[PDB]
mmCIF file of C-alpha atoms in Angstrom:
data_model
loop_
_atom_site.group_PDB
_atom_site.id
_atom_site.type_symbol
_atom_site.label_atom_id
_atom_site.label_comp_id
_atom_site.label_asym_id
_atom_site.label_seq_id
_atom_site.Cartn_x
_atom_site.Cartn_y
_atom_site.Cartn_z
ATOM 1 C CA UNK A 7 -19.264 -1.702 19.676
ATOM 2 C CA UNK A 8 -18.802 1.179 16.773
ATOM 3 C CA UNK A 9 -21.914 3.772 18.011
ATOM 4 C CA UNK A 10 -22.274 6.883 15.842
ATOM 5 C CA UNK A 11 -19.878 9.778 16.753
ATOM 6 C CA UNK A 12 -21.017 13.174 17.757
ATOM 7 C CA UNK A 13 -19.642 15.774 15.137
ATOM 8 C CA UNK A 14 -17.849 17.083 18.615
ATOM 9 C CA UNK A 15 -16.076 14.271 19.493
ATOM 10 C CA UNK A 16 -15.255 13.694 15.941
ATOM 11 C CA UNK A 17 -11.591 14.663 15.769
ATOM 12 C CA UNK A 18 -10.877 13.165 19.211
ATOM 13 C CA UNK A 19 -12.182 9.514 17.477
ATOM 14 C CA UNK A 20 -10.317 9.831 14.555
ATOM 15 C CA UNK A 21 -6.498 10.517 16.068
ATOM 16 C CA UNK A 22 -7.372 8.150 18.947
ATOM 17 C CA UNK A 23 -8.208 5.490 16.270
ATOM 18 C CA UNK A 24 -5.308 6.635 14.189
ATOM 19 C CA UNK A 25 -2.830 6.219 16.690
ATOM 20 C CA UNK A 26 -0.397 3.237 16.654
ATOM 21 C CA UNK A 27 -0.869 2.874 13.115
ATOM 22 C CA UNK A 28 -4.427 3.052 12.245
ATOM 23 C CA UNK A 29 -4.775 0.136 14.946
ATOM 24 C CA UNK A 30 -8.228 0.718 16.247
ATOM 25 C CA UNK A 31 -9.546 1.818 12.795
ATOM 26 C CA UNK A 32 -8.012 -1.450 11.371
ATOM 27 C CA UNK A 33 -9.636 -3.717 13.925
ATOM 28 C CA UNK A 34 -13.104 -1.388 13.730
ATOM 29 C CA UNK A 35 -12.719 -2.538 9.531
ATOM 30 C CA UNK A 36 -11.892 -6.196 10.349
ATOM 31 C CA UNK A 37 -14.872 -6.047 13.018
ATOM 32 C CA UNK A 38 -17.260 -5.421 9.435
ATOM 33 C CA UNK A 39 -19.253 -8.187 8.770
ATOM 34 C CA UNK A 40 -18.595 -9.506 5.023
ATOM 35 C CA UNK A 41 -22.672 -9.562 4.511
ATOM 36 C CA UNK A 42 -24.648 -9.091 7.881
ATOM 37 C CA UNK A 43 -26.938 -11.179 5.597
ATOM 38 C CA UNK A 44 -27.279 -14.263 3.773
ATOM 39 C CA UNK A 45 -27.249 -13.606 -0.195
ATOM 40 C CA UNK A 46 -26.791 -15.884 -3.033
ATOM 41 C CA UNK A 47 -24.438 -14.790 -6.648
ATOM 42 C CA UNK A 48 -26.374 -17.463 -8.809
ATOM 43 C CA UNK A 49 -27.473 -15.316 -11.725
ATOM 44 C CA UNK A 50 -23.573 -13.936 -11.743
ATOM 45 C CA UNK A 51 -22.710 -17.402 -11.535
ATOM 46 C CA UNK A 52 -23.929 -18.503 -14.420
ATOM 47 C CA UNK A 53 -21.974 -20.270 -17.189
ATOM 48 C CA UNK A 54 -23.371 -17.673 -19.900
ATOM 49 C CA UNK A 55 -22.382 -14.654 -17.765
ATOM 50 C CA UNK A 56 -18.946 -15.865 -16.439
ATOM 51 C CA UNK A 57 -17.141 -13.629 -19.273
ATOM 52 C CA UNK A 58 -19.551 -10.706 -18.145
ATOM 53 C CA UNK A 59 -17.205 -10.255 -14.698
ATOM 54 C CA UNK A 60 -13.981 -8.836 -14.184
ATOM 55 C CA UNK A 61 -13.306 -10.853 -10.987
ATOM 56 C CA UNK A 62 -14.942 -14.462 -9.690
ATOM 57 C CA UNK A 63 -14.861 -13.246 -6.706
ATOM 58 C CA UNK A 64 -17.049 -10.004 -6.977
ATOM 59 C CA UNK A 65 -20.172 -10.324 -7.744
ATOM 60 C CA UNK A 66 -23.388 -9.148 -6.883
ATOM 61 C CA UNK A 67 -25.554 -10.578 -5.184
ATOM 62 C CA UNK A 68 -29.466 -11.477 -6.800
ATOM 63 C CA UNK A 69 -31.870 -9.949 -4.237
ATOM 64 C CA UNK A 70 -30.051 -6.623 -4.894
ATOM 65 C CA UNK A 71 -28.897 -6.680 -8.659
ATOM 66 C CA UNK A 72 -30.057 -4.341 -11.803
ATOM 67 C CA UNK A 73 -31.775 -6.212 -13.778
ATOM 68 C CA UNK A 74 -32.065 -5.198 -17.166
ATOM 69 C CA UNK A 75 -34.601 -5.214 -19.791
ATOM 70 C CA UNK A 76 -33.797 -9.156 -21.903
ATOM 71 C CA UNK A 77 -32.404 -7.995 -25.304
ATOM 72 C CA UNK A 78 -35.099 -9.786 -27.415
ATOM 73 C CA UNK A 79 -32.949 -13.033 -29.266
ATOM 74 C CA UNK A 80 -30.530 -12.421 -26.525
ATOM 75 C CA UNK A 81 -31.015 -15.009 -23.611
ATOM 76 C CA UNK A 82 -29.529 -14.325 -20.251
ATOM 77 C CA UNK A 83 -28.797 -10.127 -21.197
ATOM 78 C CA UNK A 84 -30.867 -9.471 -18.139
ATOM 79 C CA UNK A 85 -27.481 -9.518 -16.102
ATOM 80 C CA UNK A 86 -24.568 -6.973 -15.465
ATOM 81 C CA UNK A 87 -22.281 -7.008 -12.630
ATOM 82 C CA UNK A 88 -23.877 -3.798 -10.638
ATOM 83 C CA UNK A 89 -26.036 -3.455 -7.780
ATOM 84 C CA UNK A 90 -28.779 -0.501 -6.095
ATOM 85 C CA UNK A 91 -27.180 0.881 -3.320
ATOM 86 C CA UNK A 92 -28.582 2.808 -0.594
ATOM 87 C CA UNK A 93 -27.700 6.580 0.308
ATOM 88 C CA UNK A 94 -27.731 8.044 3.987
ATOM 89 C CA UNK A 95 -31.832 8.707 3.573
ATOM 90 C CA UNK A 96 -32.278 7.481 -0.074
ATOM 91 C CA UNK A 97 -33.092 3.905 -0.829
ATOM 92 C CA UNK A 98 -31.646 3.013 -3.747
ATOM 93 C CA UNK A 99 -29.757 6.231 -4.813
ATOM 94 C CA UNK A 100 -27.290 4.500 -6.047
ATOM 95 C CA UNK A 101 -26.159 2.190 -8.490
ATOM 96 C CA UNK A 102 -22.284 0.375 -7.605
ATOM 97 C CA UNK A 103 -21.250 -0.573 -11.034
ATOM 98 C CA UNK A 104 -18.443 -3.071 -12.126
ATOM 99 C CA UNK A 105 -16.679 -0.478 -14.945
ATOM 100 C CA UNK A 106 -17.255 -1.970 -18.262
ATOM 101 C CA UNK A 107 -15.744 -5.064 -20.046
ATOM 102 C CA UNK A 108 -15.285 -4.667 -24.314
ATOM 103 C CA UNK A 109 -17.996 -7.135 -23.701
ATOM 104 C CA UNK A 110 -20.353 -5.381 -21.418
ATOM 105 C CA UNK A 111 -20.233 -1.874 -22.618
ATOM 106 C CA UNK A 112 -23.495 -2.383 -24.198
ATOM 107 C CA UNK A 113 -24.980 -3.788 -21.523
ATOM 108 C CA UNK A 114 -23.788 -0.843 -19.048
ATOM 109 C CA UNK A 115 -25.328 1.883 -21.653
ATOM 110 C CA UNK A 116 -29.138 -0.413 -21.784
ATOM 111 C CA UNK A 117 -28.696 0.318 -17.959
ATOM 112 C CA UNK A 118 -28.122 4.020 -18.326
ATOM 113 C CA UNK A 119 -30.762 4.472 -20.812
ATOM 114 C CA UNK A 120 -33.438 1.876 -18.377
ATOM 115 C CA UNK A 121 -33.080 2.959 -15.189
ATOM 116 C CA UNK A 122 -32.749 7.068 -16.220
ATOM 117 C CA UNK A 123 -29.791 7.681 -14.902
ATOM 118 C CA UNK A 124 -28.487 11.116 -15.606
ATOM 119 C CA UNK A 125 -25.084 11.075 -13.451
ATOM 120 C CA UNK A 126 -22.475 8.639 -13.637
ATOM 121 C CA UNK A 127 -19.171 9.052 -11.470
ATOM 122 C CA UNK A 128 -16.061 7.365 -12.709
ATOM 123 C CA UNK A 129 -13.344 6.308 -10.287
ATOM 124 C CA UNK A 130 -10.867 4.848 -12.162
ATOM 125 C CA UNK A 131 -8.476 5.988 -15.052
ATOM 126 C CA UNK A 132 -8.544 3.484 -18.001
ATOM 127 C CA UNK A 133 -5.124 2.351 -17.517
ATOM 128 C CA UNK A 134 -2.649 1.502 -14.033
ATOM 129 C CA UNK A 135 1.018 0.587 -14.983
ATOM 130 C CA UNK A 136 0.242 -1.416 -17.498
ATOM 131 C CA UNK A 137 -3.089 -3.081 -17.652
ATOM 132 C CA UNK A 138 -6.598 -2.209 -18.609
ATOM 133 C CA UNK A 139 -8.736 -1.313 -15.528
ATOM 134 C CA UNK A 140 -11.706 -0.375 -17.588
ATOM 135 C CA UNK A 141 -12.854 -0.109 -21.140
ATOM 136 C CA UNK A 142 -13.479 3.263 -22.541
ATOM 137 C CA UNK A 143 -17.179 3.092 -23.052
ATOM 138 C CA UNK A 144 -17.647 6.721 -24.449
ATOM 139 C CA UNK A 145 -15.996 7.958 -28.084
ATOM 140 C CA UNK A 146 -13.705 11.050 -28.172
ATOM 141 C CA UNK A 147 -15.842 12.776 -30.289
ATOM 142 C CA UNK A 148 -18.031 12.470 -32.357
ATOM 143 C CA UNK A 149 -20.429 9.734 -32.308
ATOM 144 C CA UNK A 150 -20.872 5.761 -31.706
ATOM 145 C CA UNK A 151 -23.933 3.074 -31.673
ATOM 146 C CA UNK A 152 -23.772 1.033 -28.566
ATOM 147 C CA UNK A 153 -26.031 -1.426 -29.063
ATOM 148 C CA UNK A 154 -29.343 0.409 -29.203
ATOM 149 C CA UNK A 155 -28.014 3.102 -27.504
ATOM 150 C CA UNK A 156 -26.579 6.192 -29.468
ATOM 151 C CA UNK A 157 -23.541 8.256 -27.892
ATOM 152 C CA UNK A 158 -21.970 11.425 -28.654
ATOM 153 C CA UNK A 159 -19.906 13.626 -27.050
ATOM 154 C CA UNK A 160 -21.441 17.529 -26.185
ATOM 155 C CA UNK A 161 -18.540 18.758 -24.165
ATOM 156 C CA UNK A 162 -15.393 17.696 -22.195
ATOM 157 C CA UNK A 163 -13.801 19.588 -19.420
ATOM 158 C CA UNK A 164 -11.136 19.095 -17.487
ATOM 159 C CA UNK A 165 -10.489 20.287 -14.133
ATOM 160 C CA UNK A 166 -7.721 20.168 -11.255
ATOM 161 C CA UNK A 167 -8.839 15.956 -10.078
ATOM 162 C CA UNK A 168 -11.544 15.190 -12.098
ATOM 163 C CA UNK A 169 -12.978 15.728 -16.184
ATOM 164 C CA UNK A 170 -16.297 16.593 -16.409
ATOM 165 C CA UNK A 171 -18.066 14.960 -20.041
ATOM 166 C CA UNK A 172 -20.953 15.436 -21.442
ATOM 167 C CA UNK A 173 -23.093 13.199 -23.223
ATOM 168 C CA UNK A 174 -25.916 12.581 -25.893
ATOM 169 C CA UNK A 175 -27.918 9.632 -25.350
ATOM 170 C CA UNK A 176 -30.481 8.013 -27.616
ATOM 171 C CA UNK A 177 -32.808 5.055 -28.104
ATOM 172 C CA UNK A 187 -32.541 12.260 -26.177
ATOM 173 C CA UNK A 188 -30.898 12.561 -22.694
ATOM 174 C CA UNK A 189 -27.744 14.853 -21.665
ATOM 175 C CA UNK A 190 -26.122 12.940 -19.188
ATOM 176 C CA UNK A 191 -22.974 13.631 -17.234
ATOM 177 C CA UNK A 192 -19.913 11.586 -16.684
ATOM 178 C CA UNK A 193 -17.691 13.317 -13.252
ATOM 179 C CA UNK A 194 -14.384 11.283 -13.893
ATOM 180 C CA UNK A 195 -11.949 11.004 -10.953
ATOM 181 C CA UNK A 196 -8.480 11.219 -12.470
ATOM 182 C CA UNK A 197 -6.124 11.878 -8.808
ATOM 183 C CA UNK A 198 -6.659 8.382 -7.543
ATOM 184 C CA UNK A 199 -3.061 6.556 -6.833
ATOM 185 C CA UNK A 200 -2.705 2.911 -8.216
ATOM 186 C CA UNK A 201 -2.105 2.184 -4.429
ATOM 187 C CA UNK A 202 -3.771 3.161 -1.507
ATOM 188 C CA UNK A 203 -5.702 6.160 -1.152
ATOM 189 C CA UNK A 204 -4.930 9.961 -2.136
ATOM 190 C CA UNK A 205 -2.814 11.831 0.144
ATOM 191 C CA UNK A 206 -5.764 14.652 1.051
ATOM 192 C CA UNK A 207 -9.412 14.046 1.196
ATOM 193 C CA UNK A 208 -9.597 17.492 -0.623
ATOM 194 C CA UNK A 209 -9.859 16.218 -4.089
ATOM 195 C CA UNK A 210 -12.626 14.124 -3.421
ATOM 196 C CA UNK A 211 -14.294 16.111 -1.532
ATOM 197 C CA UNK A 212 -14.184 19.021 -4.423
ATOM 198 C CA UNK A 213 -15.359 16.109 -6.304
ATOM 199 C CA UNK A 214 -18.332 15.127 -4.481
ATOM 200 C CA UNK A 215 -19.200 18.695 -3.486
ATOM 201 C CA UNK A 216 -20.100 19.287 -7.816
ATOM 202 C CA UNK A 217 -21.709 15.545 -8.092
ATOM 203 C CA UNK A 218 -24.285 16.578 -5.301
ATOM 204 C CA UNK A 219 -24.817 19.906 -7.341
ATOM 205 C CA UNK A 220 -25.084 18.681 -10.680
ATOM 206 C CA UNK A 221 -27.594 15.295 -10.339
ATOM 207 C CA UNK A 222 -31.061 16.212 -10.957
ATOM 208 C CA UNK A 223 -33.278 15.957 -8.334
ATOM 209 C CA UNK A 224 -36.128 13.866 -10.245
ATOM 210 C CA UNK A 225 -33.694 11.588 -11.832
ATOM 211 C CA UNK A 226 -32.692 7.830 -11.659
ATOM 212 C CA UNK A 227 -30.014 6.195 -10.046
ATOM 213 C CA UNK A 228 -26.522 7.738 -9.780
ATOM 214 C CA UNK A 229 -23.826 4.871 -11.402
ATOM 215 C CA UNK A 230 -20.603 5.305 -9.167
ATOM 216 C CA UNK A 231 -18.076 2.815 -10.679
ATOM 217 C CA UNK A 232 -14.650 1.982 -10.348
ATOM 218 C CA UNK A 233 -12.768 -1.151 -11.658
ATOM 219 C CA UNK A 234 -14.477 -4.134 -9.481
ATOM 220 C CA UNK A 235 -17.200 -1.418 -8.684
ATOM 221 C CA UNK A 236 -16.558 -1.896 -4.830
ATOM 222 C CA UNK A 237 -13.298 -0.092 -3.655
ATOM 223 C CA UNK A 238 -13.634 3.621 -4.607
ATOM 224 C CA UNK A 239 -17.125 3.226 -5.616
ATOM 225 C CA UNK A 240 -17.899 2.327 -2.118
ATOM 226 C CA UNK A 241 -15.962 4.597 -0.435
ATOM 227 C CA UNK A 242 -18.005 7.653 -2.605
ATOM 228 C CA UNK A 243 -21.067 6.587 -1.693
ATOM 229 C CA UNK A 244 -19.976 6.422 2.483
ATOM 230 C CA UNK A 245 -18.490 9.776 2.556
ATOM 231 C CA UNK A 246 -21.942 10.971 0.235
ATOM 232 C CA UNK A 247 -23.840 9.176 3.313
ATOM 233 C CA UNK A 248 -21.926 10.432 6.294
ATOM 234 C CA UNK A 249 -21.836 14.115 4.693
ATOM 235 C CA UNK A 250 -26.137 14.065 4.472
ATOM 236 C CA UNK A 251 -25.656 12.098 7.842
ATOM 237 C CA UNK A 252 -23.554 14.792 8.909
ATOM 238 C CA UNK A 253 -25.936 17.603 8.161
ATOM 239 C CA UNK A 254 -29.143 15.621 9.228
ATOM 240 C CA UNK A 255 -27.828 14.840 12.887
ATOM 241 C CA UNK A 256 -24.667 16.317 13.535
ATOM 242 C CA UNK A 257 -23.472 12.943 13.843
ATOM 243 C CA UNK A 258 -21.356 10.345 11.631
ATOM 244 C CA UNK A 259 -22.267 6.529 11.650
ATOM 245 C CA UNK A 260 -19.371 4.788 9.320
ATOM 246 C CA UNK A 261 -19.480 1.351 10.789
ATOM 247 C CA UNK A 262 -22.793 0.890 11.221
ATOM 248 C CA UNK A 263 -23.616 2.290 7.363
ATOM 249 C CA UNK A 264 -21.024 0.123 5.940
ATOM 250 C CA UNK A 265 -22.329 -2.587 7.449
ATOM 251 C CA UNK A 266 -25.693 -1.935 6.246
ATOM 252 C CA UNK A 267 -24.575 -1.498 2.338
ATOM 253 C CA UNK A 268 -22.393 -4.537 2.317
ATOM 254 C CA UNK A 269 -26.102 -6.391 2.727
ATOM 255 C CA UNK A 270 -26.418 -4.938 -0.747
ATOM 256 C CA UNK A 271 -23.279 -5.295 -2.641
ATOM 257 C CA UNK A 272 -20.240 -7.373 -1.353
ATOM 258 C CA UNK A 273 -16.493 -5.706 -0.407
ATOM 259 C CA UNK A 274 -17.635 -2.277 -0.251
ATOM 260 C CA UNK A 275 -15.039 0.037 1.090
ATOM 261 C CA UNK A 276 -12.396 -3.081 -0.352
ATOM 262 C CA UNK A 277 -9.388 -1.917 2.105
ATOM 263 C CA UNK A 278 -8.805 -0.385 5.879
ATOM 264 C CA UNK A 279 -6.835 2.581 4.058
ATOM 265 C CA UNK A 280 -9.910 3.760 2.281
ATOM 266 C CA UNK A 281 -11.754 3.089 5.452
ATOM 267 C CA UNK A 282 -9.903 5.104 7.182
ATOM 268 C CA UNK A 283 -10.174 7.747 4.203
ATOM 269 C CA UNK A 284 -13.354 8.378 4.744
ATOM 270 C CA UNK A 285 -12.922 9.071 8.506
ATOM 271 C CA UNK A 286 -10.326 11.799 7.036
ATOM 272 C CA UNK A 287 -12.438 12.961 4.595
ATOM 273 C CA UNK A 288 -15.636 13.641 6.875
ATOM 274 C CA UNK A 289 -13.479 15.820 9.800
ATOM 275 C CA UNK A 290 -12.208 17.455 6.939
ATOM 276 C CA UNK A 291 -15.183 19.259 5.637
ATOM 277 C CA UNK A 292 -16.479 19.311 8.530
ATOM 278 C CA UNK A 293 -12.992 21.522 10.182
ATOM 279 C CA UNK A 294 -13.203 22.751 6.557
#
């Protein structure tokens, strides 16, 4: 049994957890259930949409995937590797998105144009040693046709962890891209600061009478996930003075497979939440 933690008995959990190597926190991870539910992955599973995932092995499920809008002459474009996820008190706030394919980018900009989203959060850089971990769906400068959907850049800056860009969507919308640049191609950053400085501008900068937020990373699980816990145990946090990690992870993982992929970033967002809440 996992039952929420008082804010007050918050730091007490976490080192008692954290002691003999994360042992506690590992077994409270491996306790997770890999879908409290039963789901099915047919429409991902589909012959025509096998080049449309990164990974056989995650994809979402069909009670809980975006649908989007059929391309007229295009059968089967109603799928993309992304499902709604829920926030702390916000039922479907956001949207866990595989990050783009050469293939898909299209497809991912129909679902920022169709579902209004205004905010999308980028976990990933392009490239780890080597290999392509996500294609860059966005020009420079200048501007590009997606599809149906027009892009151009308005402004790019970059800060300390993360670049803030600023887009110009059409077929007009300004939406804004928060990029996470200080994640480690292994386990998870050294300090919960960064990400916290991070999530602190995201919850500042989304319109309140907006779509869905898209958080995605390279499977759209791992870091994507752990955003949208620490987002939920921060409201959470606020709300009730309390912090329910298990029991919300449990709950989203009804929604989209893996999330929070590994027991370090599980344990990351333990860190994270006594750290802004010590400050």
């Amino acid at each position: 049994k996992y039952p929420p933690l008082p804010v007050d008995k918050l730091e007490e959990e976490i080192n008692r957890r954290m002691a003999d190597d994360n042992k506690l926190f590992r077994e409270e991870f491996n306790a997770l259930p890999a879908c409290p539910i039963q789901a099915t992955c047919e429409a991902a599973s589909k012959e025509e949409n096998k080049e449309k995932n990164r990974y056989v092995n995650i994809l979402p499920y069909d009670h809980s995937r975006v649908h989007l809008t059929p391309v007229e002459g295009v059968p089967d474009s109603d799928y993309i590797n992304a499902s709604f996820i829920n926030g702390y008190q916000e039922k479907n706030k956001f949207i866990a998105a595989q990050g783009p394919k050469e293939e898909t980018v299209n497809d991912f900009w129909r679902m920022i144009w169709e579902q209004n989203t205004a905010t999308i959060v980028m976990v990933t850089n392009l490239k780890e040693r080597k290999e392509c971990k996500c294609a860059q769906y966005w020009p420079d400068q200048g501007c590009w046709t997606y599809g149906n959907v027009r892009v151009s850049v308005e402004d790019v800056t970059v800060l300390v962890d993360y670049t803030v860009r600023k887009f110009c969507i059409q077929q007009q919308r300004l939406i804004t891209q928060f990029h996470f640049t200080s994640w480690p191609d292994f386990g998870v950053p050294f300090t919960p600061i960064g990400m916290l400085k991070f999530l602190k501008k995201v919850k500042a900068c989304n319109p309140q009478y907006a779509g869905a937020i898209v958080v995605h990373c390279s499977a759209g699980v791992g870091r994507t996930g752990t955003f949208v816990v620490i987002d939920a145990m921060l409201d959470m946090m606020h709300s009730e003075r309390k912090v329910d990690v298990y029991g919300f992870v449990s709950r989203i993982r009804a929604q989209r497979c893996q999330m929070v992929q590994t027991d370090m970033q599980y344990v990351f967002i333990y860190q994270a939440l006594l750290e802004h809440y010590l400050y």
